[PDB]
Amino acid sequence: DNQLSLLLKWRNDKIPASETDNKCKVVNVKNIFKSDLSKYGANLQALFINALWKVKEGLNINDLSNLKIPLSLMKNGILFIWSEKEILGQIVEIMEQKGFTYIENFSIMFLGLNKCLQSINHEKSIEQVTQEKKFVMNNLDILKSTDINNLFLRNNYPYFKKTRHTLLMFRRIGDKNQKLELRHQRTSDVVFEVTDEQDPSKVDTMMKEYVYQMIETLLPKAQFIPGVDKHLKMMELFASTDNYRPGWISVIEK
Amino acid sequence: YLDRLPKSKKGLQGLLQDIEKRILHYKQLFFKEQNEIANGKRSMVPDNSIPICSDVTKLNFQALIDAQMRHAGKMFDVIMMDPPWQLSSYDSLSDEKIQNMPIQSLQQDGFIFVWAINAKYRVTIKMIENWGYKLVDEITWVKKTVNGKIAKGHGFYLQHAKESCLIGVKGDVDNGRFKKNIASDVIFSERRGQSQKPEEIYQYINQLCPNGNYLEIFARRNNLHDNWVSIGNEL
Amino acid sequence: LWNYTLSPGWREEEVKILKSALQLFGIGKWKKIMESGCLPGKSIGQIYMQTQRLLGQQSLGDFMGLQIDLEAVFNQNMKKQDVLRKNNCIINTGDNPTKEERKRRIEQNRKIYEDIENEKFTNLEILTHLYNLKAEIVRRLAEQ
Amino acid sequence: PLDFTQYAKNMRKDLSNQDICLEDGALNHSYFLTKKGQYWTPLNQKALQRGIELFGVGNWKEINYDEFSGKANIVELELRTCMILGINDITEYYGKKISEEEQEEIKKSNIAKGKKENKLKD
Numbered sequence: 001d002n003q004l005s006l007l008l009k010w011r012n013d014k015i016p017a018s019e020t021d022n023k024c025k026v027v028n029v030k031n032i033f034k035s036d037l038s039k040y041g042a043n044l045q046a047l048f049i050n051a052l053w054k055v056k057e058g059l060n061i062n063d064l065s066n067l068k069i070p071l072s073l074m075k076n077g078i079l080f081i082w083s084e085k086e087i088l089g090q091i092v093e094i095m096e097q098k099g100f101t102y103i104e105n106f107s108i109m110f111l112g113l114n115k116c117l118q119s120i121n122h123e124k125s126i127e128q129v130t131q132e133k134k135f136v137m138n139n140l141d142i143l144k145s146t147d148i149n150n151l152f153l154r155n156n157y158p159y160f161k162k163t164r165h166t167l168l169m170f171r172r173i174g175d176k177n178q179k180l181e182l183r184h185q186r187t188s189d190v191v192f193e194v195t196d197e198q199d200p201s202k203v204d205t206m207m208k209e210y211v212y213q214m215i216e217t218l219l220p221k222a223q224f225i226p227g228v229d230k231h232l233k234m235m236e237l238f239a240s241t242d243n244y245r246p247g248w249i250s251v252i253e254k
Numbered sequence: 255y256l257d258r259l260p261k262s263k264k265g266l267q268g269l270l271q272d273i274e275k276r277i278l279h280y281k282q283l284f285f286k287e288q289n290e291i292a293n294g295k296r297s298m299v300p301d302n303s304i305p306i307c308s309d310v311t312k313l314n315f316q317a318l319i320d321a322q323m324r325h326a327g328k329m330f331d332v333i334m335m336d337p338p339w340q341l342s343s344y345d346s347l348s349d350e351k352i353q354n355m356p357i358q359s360l361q362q363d364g365f366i367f368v369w370a371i372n373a374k375y376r377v378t379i380k381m382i383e384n385w386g387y388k389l390v391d392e393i394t395w396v397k398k399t400v401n402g403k404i405a406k407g408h409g410f411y412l413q414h415a416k417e418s419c420l421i422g423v424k425g426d427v428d429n430g431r432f433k434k435n436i437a438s439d440v441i442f443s444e445r446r447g448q449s450q451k452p453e454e455i456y457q458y459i460n461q462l463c464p465n466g467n468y469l470e471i472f473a474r475r476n477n478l479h480d481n482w483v484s485i486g487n488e489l
Numbered sequence: 490l491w492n493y494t495l496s497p498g499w500r501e502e503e504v505k506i507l508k509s510a511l512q513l514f515g516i517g518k519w520k521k522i523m524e525s526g527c528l529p530g531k532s533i534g535q536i537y538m539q540t541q542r543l544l545g546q547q548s549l550g551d552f553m554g555l556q557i558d559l560e561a562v563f564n565q566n567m568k569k570q571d572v573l574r575k576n577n578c579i580i581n582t583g584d585n586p587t588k589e590e591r592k593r594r595i596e597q598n599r600k601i602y603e604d605i606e607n608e609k610f611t612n613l614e615i616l617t618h619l620y621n622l623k624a625e626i627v628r629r630l631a632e633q
Numbered sequence: 634p635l636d637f638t639q640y641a642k643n644m645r646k647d648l649s650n651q652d653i654c655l656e657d658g659a660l661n662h663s664y665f666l667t668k669k670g671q672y673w674t675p676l677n678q679k680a681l682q683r684g685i686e687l688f689g690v691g692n693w694k695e696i697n698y699d700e701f702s703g704k705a706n707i708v709e710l711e712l713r714t715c716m717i718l719g720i721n722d723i724t725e726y727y728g729k730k731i732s733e734e735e736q737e738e739i740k741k742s743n744i745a746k747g748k749k750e751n752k753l754k755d
């Protein structure tokens with residue numbers, strides 16, 4: 001009916017922490033949009049920042065302009081940043097003056113988990129946002145008789161109803177006769193998952209994990225197991241306080 | 255190789271007879287159709303559709319705004335355009351050519367919508383912030399297949415499977431006739447003809463700024479609706 | 490039976506036109522075949538598969554750029570009929586070899602050897618094709 | 634202006650092309666239903682009437698030469714010169730000039746031959 005089985009096909013592939021070693025590097029500085037990052041890695045490929053903009057708020061947009069990215073930090077590489085609808089704009093123009101070029105975008109469309117459970121019937125706890133998503137996942141073909149557009153989010157927004165989140169992804173080419181290795185078409189620009197209405201901007205695990213898996217697939221060469229190399233060719237900012245993903249040079253702001 | 259039969263003599267002429275009566279059949283049907291149209295028959299385009307068919311560069315928007323002031327007194331409220339973008343494997347649609355057109359003259363109080371592909375997403379932002387418009391929101395349309403799958407769009411860096419549209423604001427958008435948080439900014443509908451667009455976005459706009467003149471740009475015969483002053487080379 | 494296996498819905502006259510065009514131009518020069526225009530309504534892919542059937546070997550990598558006799562290759566493929574010739578086509582044992590190996594294979598193989606009434610069109614253009622179709626038929630009867 | 638219909642008519646008169654909307658007319662659905670490139674304004678039909686006045690039905694092959702209609706097409710023009718005569722075949726008017734119609738009255742009496750859709754079968 002809805003063909004929703006194919007919509008969440010990759011969500012059925014779950015695949016959900018390396019200690020400080022040759023495979024994982026850890027940095028915990030109280031400053032990040034000011035701390036030099038070229039000393040934490042050079043000629044890297046994947047560079048992720050988990051910028052939780054929100055209009056409470058986690059990070060101020062105007063702060064981002066003071067961060068410096070040097071060519072010595074990375075010649076050929078990519079930055080990944082989050083976008084929030086109430087703070088949409090004023091974020092799409094900051095990064096170009098730091099020396100990147102726009103290539104593509106990625107986005108997450110939230111299908112209103114409360115509406116999904118309502119259609120299955122015919123504030124949420126951590127359990128209600130972790131196991132309830134499995135609950136609506138395993139019976140994914142019972143609500144396929146309904147309309148897709150019904151179960152979308154209805155969140156307060158000045159102009160429309162806010163429904164989706166967004167990953168801006170920016171590649172810089174900086175060295176002539178040098179390129180990057182990419183898998184390219186791995187995960188569709190359209191993806192599908194539900195998200196709690198309490199923090200639609202926030203993305204919990206099994207979805208953050210989905211992004212982690214897709215980025216690990218897009219840039220496999222950036223990773224390095226402890227035996228092959230000790231220095232990691234891909235770093236991260238603003239991760240969880242307990243997750244230290246292998247390959248990533250984690251930089252958590254305390 | 256000749257498509258027709260090489261030699262059949264009168265054996266084919268009999269078939270000719272068949273064909274020729276078929277011929278008369280078509281024209282007699284045509285006559286009926288003629289009687290059906292020259293009697294007062296109403297076509298699909300509804301009332302209050304104003305299809306200005308002219309080149310956007312050739313057209314003088316000054317006459318348009320003069321008519322706007324003369325008849326209504328309020329200038330435009332909601333505007334849209336999905337111009338032919340650049341693909342790099344007409345050529346006067348250079349994004350700069352799209353820019354220099356004085357849409358800022360055509361609008362002082364109201365929104366805007368601009369659909370564009372992600373390959374020209376960024377240039378769209380500079381397209382909208384250049385004027386008094388401020389990019390505030392986006393409406394996105396997810397392609398659908400016949401069954402309910404996701405279209406396997408060509409992938410440059412990721413598998414392209416959605417289409418984006420930007421929204422802007424100049425002057426005052428709280429003109430009373432505007433409505434806020436009308437509904438979701440996403441549209442899930444099938445993949446129609448080449449670069450076609452969902453007709454439910456016009457329902458969205460009717461929810462948005464009803465009882466007022468509109469302006470879509472670069473239309474086709476599909477686009478025309480009620481209360482839509484519309485422009486388009488193929489319109 | 491079923492010699493030179495036929496694609497669904499193509500005349501054998503088209504097959505012999507293709508044979509003549511391949512004998513004059515050569516395998517792989519499908520663009521020249523389109524330029525000549527002796528096979529209307531044919532695509533490069535479909536003519537490629539038809540060449541696969543006519544040569545008797547499914548893989549055309551060993552026959553690229555060859556003005557070889559199609560029937561001779563088909564006959565020598567029956568000379569090696571010990572291999573399963575599915576659809577009268579031999580599957581090449583070489584798995585997509587390098588350009589050098591494919592090139593030496595090329596060298597060795599060289600050395601060895603109604604219509605408009607359809608389309609759901611409106612009355613205007615169908616009659617446009619119909620009247621001069623009838624003129625063509627009238628001229629055909631006149632010369633008969 | 635909340636007078637949406639009058640407003641629309643005014644804008645159509647002020648901006649829209651003549652072949653799109655009449656001088657003070659409605660949307661003119663006839664142009665909409667036909668495709669862009671071939672439409673029959675009163676100018677085109679009066680020009681074809683002039684062409685009929687030129688020689689009438691017969692060996693009159695200058696139908697496209699005069700370009701009386703906008704980008705005249707021989708088959709479409711010969712098709713659209715037939716409803717005026719009201720008879721499917723024109724063999725009974727071959728080789729003569731025709732001034733007015735005087736053909737609908739002499740043929741609508743033929744009930745068996747045909748009177749529906751303002752036309753007669755053969």
Ligand SMILES: Nc1ncnc2c1ncn2[C@@H]1O[C@H](CSCC[C@H](N)C(=O)O)[C@@H](O)[C@H]1O
Pocket residue numbers: 336337338344347449450451471472473474476477486487488489
């Ligand atoms: N400069 C131009 N060159 C060619 N066609 C143009 C054109 N400007 C407008 N058009 C016409 O309008 C289309 C561009 S717009 C296409 C989408 C349409 N506006 C919609 O919303 O449904 C073209 O395909 C053509 O039909």
